Amino acid sequence: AEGVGNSSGDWHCDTKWMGDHVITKSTRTWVLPTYGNHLYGPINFDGTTGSGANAAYAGYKTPWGYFDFNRFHCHFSPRDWQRLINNHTGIRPKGLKIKVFNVQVKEVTTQDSTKTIANNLTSTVQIFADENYDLPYVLGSATQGTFPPFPNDVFMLPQYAYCTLQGNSGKFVDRSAFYCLEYFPSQMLRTGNNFEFQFKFEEVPFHSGWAQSQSLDRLMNPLLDQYLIGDYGTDASGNLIYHRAGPNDLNEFYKNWAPAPYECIQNINSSDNTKNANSINGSNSTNKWGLQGRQAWDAPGFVQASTYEGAAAGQSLLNGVLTFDKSSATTSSPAATAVNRTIEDEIQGTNNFGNARNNIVAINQQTKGTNPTTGSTSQFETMPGMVWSNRDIYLQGPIWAKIPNTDGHFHPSPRMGGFGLKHPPPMILIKNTPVPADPPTTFNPMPQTSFITEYSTGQVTVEMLWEVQKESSKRWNPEVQFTSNFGTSDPAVDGIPFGINNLGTYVESRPIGTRYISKHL
Amino acid sequence: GFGLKHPPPMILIKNTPVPADPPTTFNPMPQTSFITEYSTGQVTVEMLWEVQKESSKRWNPEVQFTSNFGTSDPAVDGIPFGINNLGTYVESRPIGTRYISKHL
Amino acid sequence: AEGVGNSSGDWHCDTKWMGDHVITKSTRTWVLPTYGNHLYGPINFDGTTGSGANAAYAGYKTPWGYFDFNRFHCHFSPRDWQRLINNHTGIRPKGLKIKVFNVQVKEVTTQDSTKTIANNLTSTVQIFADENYDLPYVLGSATQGTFPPFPNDVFMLPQYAYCTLQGNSGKFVDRSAFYCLEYFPSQMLRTGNNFEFQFKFEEVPFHSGWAQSQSLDRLMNPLLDQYLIGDYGTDASGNLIYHRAGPNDLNEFYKNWAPAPYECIQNINSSDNTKNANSINGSNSTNKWGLQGRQAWDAPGFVQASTYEGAAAGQSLLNGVLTFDKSSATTSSPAATAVNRTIEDEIQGTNNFGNARNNIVAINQQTKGTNPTTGSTSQFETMPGMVWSNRDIYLQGPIWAKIPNTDGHFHPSPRMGGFGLKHPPPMILIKNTPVPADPPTTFNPMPQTSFITEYSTGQVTVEMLWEVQKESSKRWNPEVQFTSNFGTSDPAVDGIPFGINNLGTYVESRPIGTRYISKHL
Amino acid sequence: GFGLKHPPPMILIKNTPVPADPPTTFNPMPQTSFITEYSTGQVTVEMLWEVQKESSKRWNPEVQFTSNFGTSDPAVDGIPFGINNLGTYVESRPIGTRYISKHL
């Protein structure tokens, strides 16, 4: 609204702990290139070559671009995260505000000698938030493009594309869709204008932030013995023999609850070289689920315990655990020293080890002459009276995901992590309006393909409102908490962990989960 | 369809018995001889339905249910979804409810 | 509503002349058979045999039946009609009421020895009037089935069928329609019930009931001569010569208005045998208009003067004039003595004789050496500044017709006669509900085809409200009027004209038009 | 379409001339030398339409406009009624307004 000289907004970054709720606020700077020369392309990859038939897709490209702010480390700093996870046992989102301002548009002029960048005063950007969820929602796929961890750096908004249904060999069909984005109302921003937006989340259950100090197989008073009786075998004559379950053997007890379902996942030992087999194929050893005549990876799949206390060090599941990069990088095949590989030991109480494959069930019907025989099961799914714990929310992982709109869903939670939502925060799209190059003198009915090269930039702020649970636990001895144990670091090379290294990049040392507090089942 | 805890109740009907002429003297047994009869009448049913009308912004036109049959001889089959030659009513092809594309 | 003993209505027949408006009222008795055993058939006739390819049709039959009250002689009597057309110069409908009552249902029982008819007390008829014009409207086709002229006789309601679009050889196509009539709300009538209905017409122009005593070619003061000048030819040198139109020749005058358009119609002399050619073919000599690859008769077509004063007696157009029967009869090819053949002499002022073919127009462009040449035209259509008069409404002809619902129409009036209407009186349908015969003991999922034979009967009354114009004309000498000139009649044979003959039939002697009053252009 | 006595008026636009540097001394002739320029901007149009919704009691299903194209290669034509490979917008087939059967 206000003229060129006045500023349309000011920097705000703070986190204040008010009580049962906390408010985080942050501001960053972005840059928006002009994508595709203002053209919608179709895109496809047929399964004829390269990866294979399972990789086929079909969809469109768009000149528009969008903000993806969904990860935790956008809204917290390694210190403030620590402050959260040691004291507080749960968190859920409440509402959020988002504002973009101080837009300015610049124009590039190439002489082939050098490039010239001259600030254009009159030109606009188009921005709108989609309330009705009419566009395909591409957030929640854990793609790159999210805000940088560290507030100083400048990031580049990603292009917006989507995948529709496909026939064989990646061709369109009747059900296929095409979404013209200019058909949506928007708001044109010129320097001196600002875009404000408001949202409030639906009610969701607190994420459990406590590690658990008991197990299911021991829920019992170890000094006593049950009043239920159980069958210890048969006599040599065929009579039935009874036995009572005492403290001498605690595996006999009849028990009320059962552990989680599972699907056997192959195990792999990251640190210890001598455990793994030689030259296993990652693609052929992975659990898959097929759909529509083709089959895609199932990963991570339903959560399983990576390792249990007492197991060999470095034990882990194959593609069953999330993995992150020390710092944002485009490398396709990073080295092992550049990756943070999470492990789940906090759920080992309820959830079985992934590859254990212990469960046993009876495969035949006894009678005179035939002995009862049992066998292990490679997959064991849900039945009444089971309990399980969801995967943890890492500092580096996604905040939420959009529950697909379908007839039915079973205990919706994202298998990667976070809060499943019916209505998630809407997706905010932006583009910079086209400015045509000088037209010819005479009338040409064709459309105009020649444009002035330009890009935009500005600031964006995001304000989150979080709701936390503070607890009182009466255990006597001190709990474990998250602390920084690194011995020393040379500023000539790596700098401080969780701090800018020598070359100016920001590095995230080690992954951080939320369960450090022991709480009994 | 719709699973229901309490569905519409089940409505039962019968036509009361009319006994045939009894014997003169008292017989304690029950009476098995009846007058043959049947009943008839009309019944009406009034349903109230709740629907959702939508707004989808896709650009290109959706598929919809249309009648493509080329031609029909009234000497044999009559019009599809219409009474054929012999007076029977014929339902040509099955009809589902999902013709509108909506993204996941 | 009331019980069996009381009567549901009483007889009303009267005509009262109140003023500028008149009210007619009448009551008749009907009988409704059970059609088609309560079944919808399809019906078609392919053009392979018999008449030819032009006769093909496709449609459905229905158990329903309907009242057609549209003709004039239902609502008037030959006396009351006379009273109308001599005094009054115009009439239009205003509104109407219709009521049906005293229904009673009877059942036939055949022993093969004899038939037994026993009154059923409990059974109903279904009747509804269609407001929204959803059904095909089959009135206005001048089909039989209308109420009898004479109130004593009992008539039989016609079955209801309709014709949809057709492919080649009389087959259905995509656009074809099927109308289930039970899908309409109705009213069940049992003895002691009555059905009442109310309607009011749209505004329409009075029908002109006057014959015209002038002509177009003489609109002029015969004693004078015009101040306009006109070209009488050219000199021998090529100069132009002028002439003024005087009383000596009145065909020269420049004139403001022009007579009606026409299409040449073949002439035929009904009474005089010696005029007509031998063995002409009626089908091949008739004007036709083709549609949808086939061609149907155009008759009567736009009105033309049957004969003009001075022409030979018995002169008439071929299929250009309506024709009626002395009495209702089913004969396919009646004798000439049984038919009333109307003639149009009252319009001879504006409308040209049908077969005259007088008009002349110039076919070439003159110059030195070439003489101007002209030729007669066999068809001459509308141009600005024309006047014409519509066909007369006979006592025996239809009252109204429904203007088809289309983008455009030119001066809608029915070519047969009467009042064109956007919304005509709705069509009233009735059927007698089915009563099933004794079912089998065990359950059969099939539908039940076995019914009890029955028919219904009762009375129906119709009350019309008409609006008339009474006039004042100052001509001195007495006008012609409609009078009964028949010399004598033997009651042993024909009885009185317009009265029941020997055998009990009602006979309508001669056709009666509405234009007996002379009124100048 | 719709014939009109008074149609929507015709909206005209031009960009005013800016003269190039004049000579020093006075020249009574008019000035033919101008600065080359062009203009651009946005325009919006808001229409208000009046429609008729109907009730027809025919039993069997009507024909309606649906998209029957079997398949399309995004490498060439893209989706019908959608941008093809090269960025142009293509209108597949003509569309009239009469799909509803209604008796004369």
Binding-site residues on chain D for chain A (CB distance < 8 A): 38, 40, 67-69, 71-75, 78-79, 81-85, 87
Distance CA A86, CA A480 (A): 9
Q: Please identify which residue in the block is written with the tokens 């309006």.
A: A433
For residue C103, CA distances in Å to A298, C108, C248 come to 77, 17, 74
Structure tokens at B62: 């959706």
Contact call for A132 and B55, based on CB within 8 A: yes
Structure tokens at A198: 């408001």
Q: Smallest Cα–Cα separation from C500: which of C311, C326, C292?
A: C326
Structure tokens at C193: 């019930």
The strand pair at A419-421 and A400-402 is best described as: parallel
- Measure A108 CA to nearest chain D CA, in Å: 19
Sign of CA dihedral A168, A170, A171, A177: positive
Distance CA A302, CA A286 (A): 14
3-state class (DSSP) for residue B91: coil
Distance CA C232, CA C213 (A): 31
Size of interface C-D (CB pairs under 8 A): 29
- Residue B94 CA neighbour count, 13 Å, CB half: 3
Contact call for C175 and D60, based on CB within 8 A: no
**B84 and B90 in contact (C-beta within 8 Å)?**
yes
Q: Which residues of A touch D65 (CB under 8 A)?
A: none
Structure tokens at A444: 């040409």
**C35 and C43 in contact (C-beta within 8 Å)?**
no
Q: Which residues of B touch A136 (CB under 8 A)?
A: 103
- Minimum Cα–Cα distance from D90: chain B residue: B60
Contacts of A465 (CB under 8 A, 6+ apart): A21, A22, A23, A93, A94, A95, A96
Structure tokens at C101: 């009552």
**B54 and B103 in contact (C-beta within 8 Å)?**
no
Q: Please identify which residue in the block is written with the tokens 């994508």.
A: A35
Contact call for B60 and A177, based on CB within 8 A: yes
**C514 and C209 in contact (C-beta within 8 Å)?**
yes
Chains touching D by CB (3 or more pairs below 8 Å): A, B, C
Distance CA A155, CA A153 (A): 7
Q: Which residues of D touch C406 (CB under 8 A)?
A: 104
Q: Smallest Cα–Cα separation from A63: which of A44, A41, A96?
A: A41
Q: Please identify which residue in the block is written with the tokens 């212990």.
A: A358
Q: Name which of B40, B68, B72 is nearest C172 (Cβ-Cβ).
A: B72
- Measure D104 CA to nearest chain C CA, in Å: 6
Distance CA C26, CA A487 (A): 117
The strand pair at C419-421 and C400-402 is best described as: parallel
- Minimum Cα–Cα distance from B74: chain C residue: C42
User: Other C-beta atoms within 10 Å of A343: how many?
Assistant: 17
- Minimum Cα–Cα distance from B86: chain C residue: C41
Q: Please identify which residue in the block is written with the tokens 């039940």.
A: C448
Distance CA C433, CA B38 (A): 17
**D59 and B91 in contact (C-beta within 8 Å)?**
no
Long-range contacts of A269-278 (CB under 8 A, 24+ apart): A269/A312, A269/A314, A269/A315, A269/A316, A270/A314, A270/A316, A270/A336, A270/A341, A271/A313, A271/A314, A272/A312, A272/A313, A272/A314, A275/A312, A275/A314
Distance CA C306, CA C392 (A): 12
Q: What does C32-85 look like in DSSP terms, one character per residue? A: E---TTS-PPEEEE-TTSTT-GGG-EEEEEEEEEEE---SGGGT--HHHHHHHH
Long-range contacts of B40-44 (CB under 8 A, 24+ apart): B40/C435, B40/C436
Q: Please identify which residue in the block is written with the tokens 């098995």.
A: B32
User: Other C-beta atoms within 10 Å of C5: how many?
Assistant: 6
What DSSP element (H or E) covers A323? strand A323-325
- N- to C-terminal Cα distance for chain C? 57
Distance CA C22, CA C466 (A): 5
3-state class (DSSP) for residue A345: coil
Contact call for B104 and A184, based on CB within 8 A: no
Q: Which residues of D touch A170 (CB under 8 A)?
A: 74
3-state class (DSSP) for residue A106: strand
What DSSP element (H or E) covers C126? strand C125-129
Q: Smallest Cα–Cα separation from C328: which of C76, C154, C140?
A: C154
The strand pair at C21-32 and C154-156 is best described as: parallel
Binding-site residues on chain C for chain B (CB distance < 8 A): 39-44, 58, 60, 167, 170-174, 176, 178, 435-436, 438-439, 449
Contact call for D104 and C174, based on CB within 8 A: no
DSSP state of A340: E
Distance CA C16, CA C468 (A): 13
Distance CA A88, CA A85 (A): 6
Distance CA C389, CA A114 (A): 89
3-state class (DSSP) for residue A276: coil
Distance CA A42, CA A57 (A): 11
The values of phi and psi at residue A84, to 5°, are -70, -55
**What technique solved it?**
cryo-EM
Beta bridge partners of C244: C229
Distance CA C347, CA C306 (A): 9
For residue A425, CA distances in Å to A201, A402, B66, C143, D77 come to 8, 9, 39, 71, 35
Q: Which residues of B touch A184 (CB under 8 A)?
A: 57
Long-range contacts of C77-81 (CB under 8 A, 24+ apart): C77/C15, C78/C395, C78/C498, C78/C508, C78/C512, C80/C15, C80/C24, C81/C395, C81/C512
For residue A283, CA distances in Å to A77, A280, A290, A297, C176 come to 36, 9, 14, 8, 59
Q: Please identify which residue in the block is written with the tokens 């019916």.
A: A422
- Residues A235-249 as b or e (16 or more Cβ within 10 Å = b): eeeeeeeeeebeeee
Q: Smallest Cα–Cα separation from A67: which of A183, A190, A158?
A: A158
Structure tokens at A338: 């550049």
Binding-site residues on chain D for chain B (CB distance < 8 A): 59-67, 79-82
3-state class (DSSP) for residue C193: coil
Contact call for B58 and A132, based on CB within 8 A: no
- Measure A168 CA to nearest chain D CA, in Å: 10
- Tell which residues of chain C come right before a gap with C–N over 2.5 A: none
E strand segments, C363-508: 374-376, 379-380, 400-402, 419-421, 428-432, 454-470
* Single-letter residue type at C234: T
**C63 and C38 in contact (C-beta within 8 Å)?**
yes
Contact call for C178 and D60, based on CB within 8 A: yes
Q: What does C137-178 look like in DSSP terms, one character per residue? A: --TTS--S-PPPSSTTSEEEPPEEEEE----TTS-B-TT---
Distance CA C31, CA C12 (A): 19
Helix/strand/coil percentages in chain A, nearest 5 = 5, 30, 65
Q: Smallest Cα–Cα separation from C348: which of C310, C379, C376?
A: C310
Binding-site residues on chain B for chain A (CB distance < 8 A): 55-60, 63, 101-104
3-state class (DSSP) for residue A250: coil
Structure tokens at C317: 């157009």
Size of interface A-D (CB pairs under 8 A): 47
Beta bridge partners of A268: A316
The values of phi and psi at residue A149, to 5°, are -60, -45
Examine chains A and C and say if they touch (3+ CB pairs below 8 A).
no
